[PDB]
Design an enzyme around this catalytic site. Structure first.
Site, PDB file in Angstrom:
ATOM      1  N   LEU A  17       0.774  -1.245   0.000  1.00 14.64           N
ATOM      2  CA  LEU A  17       0.000   0.000   0.000  1.00 14.64           C
ATOM      3  C   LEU A  17       0.816   1.314   0.000  1.00 14.64           C
ATOM      4  O   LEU A  17       0.483   2.242  -0.729  1.00 14.64           O
ATOM      5  CB  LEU A  17      -1.019  -0.022   1.146  1.00 14.64           C
ATOM      6  CG  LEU A  17      -2.535  -0.072   0.909  1.00 14.64           C
ATOM      7  CD1 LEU A  17      -2.971  -0.692  -0.419  1.00 14.64           C
ATOM      8  CD2 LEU A  17      -3.199  -0.783   2.088  1.00 14.64           C
ATOM      9  N   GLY A  18       1.862   1.403   0.816  1.00 13.24           N
ATOM     10  CA  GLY A  18       2.674   2.622   0.881  1.00 13.24           C
ATOM     11  C   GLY A  18       3.978   2.439   1.640  1.00 13.24           C
ATOM     12  O   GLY A  18       4.228   1.371   2.208  1.00 13.24           O
ATOM     13  N   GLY A  20       5.663   6.002   2.094  1.00 15.84           N
ATOM     14  CA  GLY A  20       6.015   7.435   2.084  1.00 15.84           C
ATOM     15  C   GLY A  20       5.458   8.350   3.166  1.00 15.84           C
ATOM     16  O   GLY A  20       5.597   9.571   3.076  1.00 15.84           O
ATOM     17  N   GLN A  21       4.835   7.758   4.189  1.00 16.00           N
ATOM     18  CA  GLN A  21       4.268   8.489   5.341  1.00 16.00           C
ATOM     19  C   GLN A  21       4.019   7.516   6.522  1.00 16.00           C
ATOM     20  O   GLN A  21       3.181   7.781   7.394  1.00 16.00           O
ATOM     21  CB  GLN A  21       2.964   9.210   4.932  1.00 16.00           C
ATOM     22  CG  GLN A  21       2.493  10.340   5.876  1.00 16.00           C
ATOM     23  CD  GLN A  21       1.650   9.860   7.076  1.00 16.00           C
ATOM     24  OE1 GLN A  21       0.743   9.029   6.943  1.00 16.00           O
ATOM     25  NE2 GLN A  21       1.949  10.401   8.251  1.00 16.00           N
ATOM     26  N   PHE A  22       4.728   6.387   6.558  1.00 16.85           N
ATOM     27  CA  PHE A  22       4.359   5.331   7.512  1.00 16.85           C
ATOM     28  C   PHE A  22       5.519   4.409   7.943  1.00 16.85           C
ATOM     29  O   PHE A  22       6.051   4.502   9.063  1.00 16.85           O
ATOM     30  CB  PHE A  22       3.190   4.472   6.949  1.00 16.85           C
ATOM     31  CG  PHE A  22       2.524   5.039   5.693  1.00 16.85           C
ATOM     32  CD1 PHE A  22       3.171   4.999   4.447  1.00 16.85           C
ATOM     33  CD2 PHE A  22       1.235   5.582   5.747  1.00 16.85           C
ATOM     34  CE1 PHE A  22       2.555   5.517   3.284  1.00 16.85           C
ATOM     35  CE2 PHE A  22       0.610   6.099   4.585  1.00 16.85           C
ATOM     36  CZ  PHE A  22       1.273   6.062   3.358  1.00 16.85           C
ATOM     37  N   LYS A  39       0.049  -2.086   9.589  1.00 15.60           N
ATOM     38  CA  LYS A  39       1.155  -1.138   9.688  1.00 15.60           C
ATOM     39  C   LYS A  39       2.340  -1.762  10.402  1.00 15.60           C
ATOM     40  O   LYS A  39       2.267  -2.074  11.592  1.00 15.60           O
ATOM     41  CB  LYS A  39       0.732   0.182  10.375  1.00 15.60           C
ATOM     42  CG  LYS A  39       1.894   1.169  10.596  1.00 15.60           C
ATOM     43  CD  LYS A  39       1.513   2.601  10.200  1.00 15.60           C
ATOM     44  CE  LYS A  39       1.076   3.462  11.372  1.00 15.60           C
ATOM     45  NZ  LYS A  39       0.545   4.758  10.848  1.00 15.60           N
ATOM     46  N   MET A  79      -9.529   0.916   4.792  1.00 14.61           N
ATOM     47  CA  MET A  79     -10.268   2.002   4.157  1.00 14.61           C
ATOM     48  C   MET A  79      -9.984   1.969   2.640  1.00 14.61           C
ATOM     49  O   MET A  79      -8.976   2.489   2.193  1.00 14.61           O
ATOM     50  CB  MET A  79      -9.868   3.359   4.794  1.00 14.61           C
ATOM     51  CG  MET A  79     -10.121   3.400   6.391  1.00 14.61           C
ATOM     52  SD  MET A  79     -11.864   3.309   6.855  1.00 14.61           S
ATOM     53  CE  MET A  79     -12.312   4.992   6.322  1.00 14.61           C
ATOM     54  N   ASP A 123      -4.045  17.677  14.406  1.00 20.28           N
ATOM     55  CA  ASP A 123      -3.563  17.756  13.000  1.00 20.28           C
ATOM     56  C   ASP A 123      -4.619  17.384  12.019  1.00 20.28           C
ATOM     57  O   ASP A 123      -4.414  16.584  11.094  1.00 20.28           O
ATOM     58  CB  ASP A 123      -2.325  16.917  12.769  1.00 20.28           C
ATOM     59  CG  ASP A 123      -1.651  17.180  11.375  1.00 20.28           C
ATOM     60  OD1 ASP A 123      -1.927  18.171  10.628  1.00 20.28           O
ATOM     61  OD2 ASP A 123      -0.838  16.309  11.007  1.00 20.28           O
TER      62      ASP A 123
HETATM   63  C1  LIG Z   1      -1.999   4.077   1.791  1.00 22.05           C
HETATM   64  C2  LIG Z   1      -3.377   3.566   1.438  1.00 22.05           C
HETATM   65  N1  LIG Z   1      -4.247   3.152   2.399  1.00 22.05           N
HETATM   66  C3  LIG Z   1      -5.485   2.690   2.121  1.00 22.05           C
HETATM   67  N2  LIG Z   1      -6.339   2.296   3.117  1.00 22.05           N
HETATM   68  C4  LIG Z   1      -5.990   2.321   4.426  1.00 22.05           C
HETATM   69  N3  LIG Z   1      -6.841   1.863   5.361  1.00 22.05           N
HETATM   70  C5  LIG Z   1      -6.370   1.940   6.642  1.00 22.05           C
HETATM   71  C6  LIG Z   1      -5.084   2.489   6.711  1.00 22.05           C
HETATM   72  C7  LIG Z   1      -4.218   2.770   7.885  1.00 22.05           C
HETATM   73  O1  LIG Z   1      -3.142   3.296   7.660  1.00 22.05           O
HETATM   74  N4  LIG Z   1      -4.639   2.407   9.111  1.00 22.05           N
HETATM   75  C8  LIG Z   1      -3.914   2.670  10.248  1.00 22.05           C
HETATM   76  C9  LIG Z   1      -4.058   3.826  11.008  1.00 22.05           C
HETATM   77  C10 LIG Z   1      -5.023   4.929  10.634  1.00 22.05           C
HETATM   78  C11 LIG Z   1      -3.311   4.020  12.185  1.00 22.05           C
HETATM   79  C12 LIG Z   1      -2.381   3.086  12.632  1.00 22.05           C
HETATM   80  C13 LIG Z   1      -2.222   1.922  11.881  1.00 22.05           C
HETATM   81  C14 LIG Z   1      -2.977   1.732  10.713  1.00 22.05           C
HETATM   82 CL1  LIG Z   1      -2.717   0.206   9.815  1.00 22.05          CL
HETATM   83  S1  LIG Z   1      -4.472   2.923   5.109  1.00 22.05           S
HETATM   84  C15 LIG Z   1      -5.887   2.634   0.805  1.00 22.05           C
HETATM   85  C16 LIG Z   1      -4.980   3.073  -0.158  1.00 22.05           C
HETATM   86  N5  LIG Z   1      -5.270   3.033  -1.491  1.00 22.05           N
HETATM   87  C17 LIG Z   1      -4.365   3.795  -2.374  1.00 22.05           C
HETATM   88  C18 LIG Z   1      -4.798   3.617  -3.820  1.00 22.05           C
HETATM   89  N6  LIG Z   1      -6.251   3.722  -3.883  1.00 22.05           N
HETATM   90  C19 LIG Z   1      -6.893   4.442  -4.979  1.00 22.05           C
HETATM   91  C20 LIG Z   1      -5.980   5.620  -5.290  1.00 22.05           C
HETATM   92  O2  LIG Z   1      -5.107   5.203  -6.358  1.00 22.05           O
HETATM   93  C21 LIG Z   1      -7.138   3.146  -2.868  1.00 22.05           C
HETATM   94  C22 LIG Z   1      -6.371   2.223  -1.951  1.00 22.05           C
HETATM   95  N7  LIG Z   1      -3.750   3.524   0.145  1.00 22.05           N
END
Ligand SMILES: Cc1nc(Nc2ncc(C(=O)Nc3c(C)cccc3Cl)s2)cc(N2CCN(CCO)CC2)n1
EC number: 2.7.10.2
Length: 243
Positions: A17-18, A20-22, A39, A79, A123
């Site tokens: 998923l990423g 660049g911010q995590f 995460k 999400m 924030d």
């Molecule tokens: C980076 C990313 N996150 C996605 N969904 C997430 N759901 C939950 C997440 C998360 O960070 N939870 C969390 C928190 C809040 C705190 C501590 C620990 C954790 Cl684990 S991140 C979807 C996504 N997409 C990119 C591409 N897409 C279309 C655009 O092209 C849709 C899919 N990209």
């Protein structure tokens, strides 16, 4: 950590998923049934602990942690639509203004909850909200943003429930402008100067005069004249009824 400790072998990782911010976020499944985001952090003391004490339909929900093993895992609800800022800049969505207002209402509900818990987010901004598959916006990253800060923060570092109110007004602007950077034409220094002089974000084209009045009310120079989130909620819901 009690029932919050998750058995890592109840996890599958389905996609990357990423970074660049995590620290690697992955989409995966928990207990073969639940979509999760996972995460993986590296060398936490506070993030999950905050997330353990707060629960609302409009706050990204912690499912658990993996603390007895290698790099720590935090697991949350997944999400599907990613960060709110990116979602808004995706022109294919062709949002109606009732959808934009409902996004404001989602975030406002989360913030009224946090306000009721006397917890300051500090924030709040579109980059820190996420969007699920049904288009519901949830407040995230709650475990320097010059353009989201009121004059008393920029000048004196005076944080309060009313500084989250200010940021929420700027977040409504970010929604009605489809993800524009607030004060897009200004540097951070210029924004701070110009806000201290009383200039405010202009009304986005998509925002009605009623909606703009709500976001504008978050930006009173006197912090005690700004509404609470309870009042912003009632106002937003009133506008939804008026349509
Ligand atoms: C980076 C990313 N996150 C996605 N969904 C997430 N759901 C939950 C997440 C998360 O960070 N939870 C969390 C928190 C809040 C705190 C501590 C620990 C954790 Cl684990 S991140 C979807 C996504 N997409 C990119 C591409 N897409 C279309 C655009 O092209 C849709 C899919 N990209």
């Amino acid at each position: 950590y009690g029932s919050w400790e998750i058995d890592p072998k109840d996890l599958t990782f389905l996609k990357e998923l990423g970074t660049g911010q995590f620290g690697v976020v992955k989409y995966g499944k928990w207990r073969g049934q639940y979509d999760v985001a996972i995460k993986m952090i590296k060398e936490f003391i506070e993030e999950a602990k905050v997330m353990m004490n707060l629960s609302h339909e409009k706050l990204v929900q912690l499912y658990g942690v993996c603390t007895k093993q290698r790099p720590i895992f935090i697991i949350t609800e997944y999400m599907a639509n990613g960060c709110l800022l990116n979602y808004l800049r995706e022109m294919r969505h062709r949002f109606q203004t009732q959808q934009l207002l409902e996004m404001c209402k989602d975030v406002c509900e989360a913030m009224e909850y946090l306000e009721s818990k006397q917890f300051l987010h500090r924030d709040l901004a579109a980059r820190n909200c996420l969007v699920n598959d049904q288009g519901v916006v949830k407040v995230s990253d709650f475990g320097f943003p010059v353009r989201w800060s009121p004059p008393e923060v920029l000048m004196y570092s005076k944080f309060s429930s009313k500084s989250d109110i200010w940021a929420f007004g700027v977040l409504m602007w970010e929604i009605y402008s489809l993800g524009k950077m607030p004060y897009e034409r200004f540097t951070n220094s210029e924004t701070a100067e110009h806000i201290a002089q009383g200039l405010r974000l202009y009304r986005p084209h998509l925002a009605s005069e009623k909606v703009y009045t709500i976001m504008y009310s978050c930006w009173h120079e006197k912090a005690d004249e700004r509404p609470t989130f309870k009042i912003l909620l009632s106002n937003i819901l009133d506008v939804m009824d008026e349509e």
